[PDB]
Amino acid sequence: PCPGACVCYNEPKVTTSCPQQGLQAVPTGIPASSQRIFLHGNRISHVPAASFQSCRNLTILWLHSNALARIDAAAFTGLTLLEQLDLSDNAQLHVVDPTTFHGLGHLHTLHLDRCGLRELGPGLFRGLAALQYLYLQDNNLQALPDNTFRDLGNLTHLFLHGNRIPSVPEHAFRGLHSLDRLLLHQNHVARVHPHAFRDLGRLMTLYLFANNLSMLPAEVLMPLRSLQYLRLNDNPWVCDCRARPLWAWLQKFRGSSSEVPCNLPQRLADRDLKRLAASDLEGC
Amino acid sequence: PCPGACVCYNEPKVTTSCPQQGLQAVPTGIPASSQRIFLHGNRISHVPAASFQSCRNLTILWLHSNALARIDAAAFTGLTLLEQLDLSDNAQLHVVDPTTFHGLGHLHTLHLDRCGLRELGPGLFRGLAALQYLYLQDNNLQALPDNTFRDLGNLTHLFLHGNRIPSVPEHAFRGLHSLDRLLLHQNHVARVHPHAFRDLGRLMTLYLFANNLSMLPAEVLMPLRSLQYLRLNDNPWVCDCRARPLWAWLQKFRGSSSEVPCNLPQRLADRDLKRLAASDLEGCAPKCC
């Protein structure tokens, strides 16, 4: 049975699609053998406790572009084979219970962008050893706590840009030894701990532009061994004695890096740091 | 002019006392000269923002034993001289905005016990540098995030018992250099990071009884130079080779420590670990195991 104006088909995968159908909640009568459920584009307010427990074969679930305000902690419980979970474009969700994603040992990608998330609870990403893609962009995140991604061993892409992150602690990115791309641009990053990127050995892309970075020690870039692209523009760079560590590292870096424009001093008229001579940096 | 009912007296402190009067909300027209406001015992469900502005000289605010459901983020904005805030016994409050306590640089004691608090948001205790007493007991806390009390450099008492805290991370208690009594009993504590007490040099009392502690490294108690009272009862202690580090630390501890009862093995059941011989702490029942 198809739960109404939905569309139900079996090839290639057992699919139940209910997109842009004025649904006010998760409909009743979804086939228990479904492997793909698309509830995007409706006005679903709450995801109750039961929801999708019947679908033991479920791997793809889309709930984006709804009116999600509350998601029960047991919303996706027992969905052992879930590979993709889409909750993006729900700017009125604001908060997720830290046990919501417990038990999803097969989850490959998790979309949580433009959800207005105020914070990331302790243990929110615990156990997600299968996670590869994590989208947390354009939320209201105001802190990046330690060990938040300690279990994401297979995580390759992490998107944190478009938040209000003020700093980076030491063990914030602990455990991400498979991370390839890390995007932190368009935040309020004013400081980074010297040893933050220690686990990022295979990181190839780092976007730090459009932040509040005044200076950056070379030590934070030392562990990055596979780095091939680096974005640092749109930052209040102070080019003097404090920039010499980053300056020396930038003369040796092999990959393609963006401009490092000096906000200060006034004498240096908005020039690139990589192209400055050693004798320009004075003023620790 | 004092509001309806209530009590307003000048000495010792300018007081607007309206307790146990059946108020449904904060009474309007509270005198601006008030140094102490007692609204406890009523049925106030919400506290709007700026509800106590104009009361610049306010130092004491009691809102306990009410029916609080939501506190506005700017409820205490402008209370630069508030010394004591009492929000306890509101087990339906559940959540407090992490910016609610910003600016209260003179706050000395903060009562948040029996509020139904579920978690502690980032920066909830930002800049509370004068805070000395923090009552967070008998709530629904499920985690003690790192750096939660990093700003509370003048805190001497921290009450966390009666929650459901499962562990103590590495930096849960960082920045608490003045801490005297830390109470963590009646929780779900199963493991403590060896360096969780690194900044607690002046600690004199530590309660850890009634938890699920199977073992405790000797390094966790190493920073506690000033310890005089330590409670470890009501824990499932495994008294085998893993307890030798804790056992040796207990042989040189000069303070008063409670009983450390053995859950396993059954031949040592309820024997005090301190009073066992080293030859008892052999075998297994886990590097040594």
Ligand SMILES: *[C@@H]1O[C@H](CO)[C@@H](O)[C@H](O)[C@H]1NC(C)=O
């Ligand atoms: C899962 O799919 C198989 C076929 O691949 C089917 O036989 C089985 O009944 C399905 N079970 C559920 C719970 O959907």
Ligand SMILES: *[C@@H]1O[C@H](CO)[C@@H](O)[C@H](O)[C@H]1NC(C)=O
């Ligand atoms: C995660 O990595 C482990 C090896 O560390 C591997 O066995 C497992 O298949 C990986 N899972 C995914 C979803 O990539």
Ligand SMILES: *[C@@H]1O[C@H](CO)[C@@H](O)[C@H](O)[C@H]1NC(C)=O
């Ligand atoms: C606070 O008290 C001082 C003197 O004790 C007085 O000058 C000031 O006006 C008082 N403020 C208010 C709001 O009553």
Ligand SMILES: *[C@@H]1O[C@H](CO)[C@@H](O)[C@H](O)[C@H]1NC(C)=O
């Ligand atoms: C902290 O307490 C000490 C006394 O132990 C006192 O001297 C100091 O002024 C206090 N600091 C603040 C910011 O309240």
Ligand SMILES: *[C@@H]1O[C@H](CO)[C@@H](O)[C@H](O)[C@H]1NC(C)=O
């Ligand atoms: C018992 O200890 C375990 C750790 O082995 C912990 O996960 C669990 O929450 C504890 N339960 C209780 C009731 O203390």
Ligand SMILES: [Cl-]
């Ligand atoms: Cl797809």
Ligand SMILES: [Cl-]
């Ligand atoms: Cl840290």
Ligand SMILES: [Cl-]
């Ligand atoms: Cl319980």
